[PDB]
Amino acid sequence: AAKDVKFGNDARVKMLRGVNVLADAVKVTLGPKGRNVVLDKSFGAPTITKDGVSVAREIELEDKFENMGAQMVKEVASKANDAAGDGTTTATVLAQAIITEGLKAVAAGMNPMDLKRGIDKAVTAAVEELKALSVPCSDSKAIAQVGTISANSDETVGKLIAEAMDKVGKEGVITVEDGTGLQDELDVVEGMQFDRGYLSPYFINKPETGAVELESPFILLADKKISNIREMLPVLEAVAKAGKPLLIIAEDVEGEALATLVVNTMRGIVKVAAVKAPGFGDRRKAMLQDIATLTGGTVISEEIGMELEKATLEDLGQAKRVVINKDTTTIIDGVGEEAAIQGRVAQIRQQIEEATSDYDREKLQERVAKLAGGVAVIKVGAATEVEMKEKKARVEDALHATRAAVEEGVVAGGGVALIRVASKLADLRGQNEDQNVGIKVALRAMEAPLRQIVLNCGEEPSVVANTVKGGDGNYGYNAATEEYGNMIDMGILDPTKVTRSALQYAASVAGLMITTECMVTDLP
């Protein structure tokens, strides 16, 4: 309808106001000594949190343009979370630091394009420096430290992640779920993990993790874009008679077949789950057959005439468990016989032998690794169900952080990595002077996270930041103990992936908001 349009300086001022509000509200929770934020949980008691993710999620400014700026920086922090699993607060702190200085530069009269080029160059150089300073994470000690640091100082999370990590190799498939009692357990089931997000967010039965859990489910191996719900109706009735959950690996469920199935999720005919089918054509049928032989099911495809109307319970797959995330789906301990799995992996190994292209060999090696490795199951022994879900979510996010670390290395925590990077890149320049100014803005932003942590601790950020900059290597300020020392020695590690993703995304949103000239919104 009628819309309000802001141009230039007014638009950027509103942007900065909204970004400042969100960034303050989130950054007050950065570091181990973060403050508390009281979020009004509607009718119930307020939730006091030190988690910047929740504070950012709950922030929605009244003013439409300020709200828009807050939402953009928030969503870029969310991109950082998705890419890394940690550093959303750091990304917001970095984003505000570039944005506040950058928008001041724009309001001065400097060219937004030059500033964006300078910040892009500085952040690219910063990522190169972080890769240079990154130390590979292969020993279980570093993995435990990373898990502890990403679990908000939880040593048990770090040590369990390290144990399960070394048990199945650094590239192995690891899953976590609730335990039996108050003791943890480590198991090696024979399953696999294929990228398949849920086709509807309403499938989520776990609000603490945004994932769908099915125990002893029925795996339907559709190789056709499902458009109607009528042709699996006998199959749905058979599953309901069986009572086990039903999940669907189809190419794409579109139209009413989705919506009706969506409706079924609140009707509870079965525990409906729908995921996309990874791979295409030959690859799609290859991993579909792999899932069939892992779960003992049969691949049903319309091309071979195997229509969903004739799909019986025997053709339907079966496994011990399945987990569905927004990006990938892990099938856990399929009931298919070990002999069939061994035959399938042998066939794919001879496919590797006959393969000549690098892509073919690499993909088939990934396939055989997926089938042979299985899944590492962790049964965390927390006391209560609330503690079950919270500890398992912490373990999951810290596990993702550890995987990011082992794929990209680790660096000094507490913002020391960015401090060292800024010290290394202090001399970097650009084509013109405004690019150099953007570089300086990015360097101050790199300083920002450690300063914010020290500010949260109550100490003066200037003295501590100067002391850390004076030190070399990984010298820094342990905030939890409020004492200086080597971050690696005191276990304050940051996954290099986390830091590089946070900085890159903060630079992205900063440049986007700096170069923005007009904003349109619904009129109040």
Ligand X SMILES: Nc1ncnc2c1ncn2[C@@H]1O[C@H](COP(=O)(O)OP(=O)(O)OP(=O)(O)O)[C@@H](O)[C@H]1O
x/- map, 53-92, Mg ion, by CB under 5 A: ---------------------------------x------
Structure tokens at 216: 């002893």
The yes or no reply on residue 33 touching its own copies (CB under 8 A) is: yes
Give the number of residues in contact with Mg ion, rule: CB under 5 A.
2
Rounded Cα–Cα distance for residues 192 and 182 (Å): 27
Q: Show the site string, 113-152: x = touches Mg ion by CB under 5 A, - = not.
A: -------------------------------------x--
CA–CA dist 41, 289 (Å, integer): 47
Q: Which does 134 bind (CB under 5 to 8 A by kind): ligand X, its own copies, Mg ion, none?
A: none
Judged by beta carbon, residue 277 or residue 457, the one nearer ligand X is 457
| Smallest distance, Mg ion to C-beta of residue 320, A | 33
Please tell me what DSSP assigns to residue 471.
S
* 32 in a known ligand binding site: yes
Q: Output 20 or 478, the one with its CB closest to ligand X.
A: 478
264 binds its own copies (CB under 8 A): no
Closest listed residue to residue 192, CA positions, set 342, 317, 373, 366: 373
Please identify, using beta-carbon distances, which residue of 458 and 470 lies nearer to its own copies.
458
**Angle at which helices 416-424 and 496-515 cross, to 10°:** 70
Residue 46 sits in the site that holds its own copies (CB under 8 A): yes
Nearest approach, Cβ of residue 419 and ligand X (Å): 11
Q: Rounded to the nearest whole angstrom, what is the least distance from the CB of residue 119 to ligand X in the complex? A: 20
User: Rounded to the nearest whole angstrom, what is the least distance from the CB of residue 208 to ligand X in the complex?
Assistant: 15
Tokens of 443: 């360097």
Cα dihedral across residues 100, 404, 393, 261: positive or negative: positive
Q: How far is the CB of 317 from Mg ion (least distance, A)?
A: 38
* Residues of this chain, 146-205, that bind Mg ion according to CB under 5 A: 150
Rule CB under 5 A: is residue 397 a binding residue for Mg ion? no
- Bridge partners of 194, per DSSP, are 329
Shortest Å distance, C-beta 385 to ligand X = 23
Is 30 labelled a binding residue? yes
User: Which of 52/245 has CB closer to Mg ion?
Assistant: 52
Q: How many CA atoms lie within 13 A of 222 on its CB side?
A: 25
DSSP 152: T
Distance of CA 511 to the CA centre of its chain: 23
CB 369 within 8 A of CB 226: no
Residue 479 marked in a binding site: yes
Q: Where are the beta strands (DSSP E) in 268-312?
A: 272-276
Query: Please, which residues have CB within 8 angstroms of residue 439's CB and are 6 or more apart in sequence?
Result: 118, 119, 121, 122, 425, 428, 429, 430
- 405-444 residues in contact with its own copies (CB under 8 A) are 437
Does residue 339 bind its own copies (CB under 8 A)? no
39 binds its own copies (CB under 8 A): yes
Smallest distance, its own copies to C-beta of residue 380, A: 13
- Rounded CA separation 409/495 (Å): 6
Nearer Cβ to ligand X (18/52): 52
**Binding letters toward its own copies, positions 154-173, x by CB under 8 A:** --------------------
Report what 492 binds from Mg ion, its own copies, ligand X, none; CB cut-off 5-8 Å by kind.
ligand X
User: Can you tell me the distance from the alpha carbon of 106 to that of 21, in angstroms, rounded to the nearest whole number?
Assistant: 20
Among 153, 228, 312, 481, binds its own copies (CB under 8 A): 228
**Three-class DSSP category at 250:** strand
Nearer to Mg ion, 53 or 488 (CB): 53
Burial of 166 (0-12, 13-18, 19+ CB in 10 A): middle
Buried b (16+ CB within 10 A) or exposed e, 423-460: bbbeebebeeebbbbbbbbbbebbbbbbbbbbbbbeee
Figure out which of the listed residues 38, 346, 386, 463 binds its own copies, where binding follows CB under 8 A: 38
**Site for Mg ion, rule CB under 5 A:** 86, 150
Residues making up the annotated binding site for ATP are 29-32, 50, 86-90, 414, 478-480, 494
Residues making up the annotated binding site are 29-32, 50, 86-90, 414, 478-480, 494
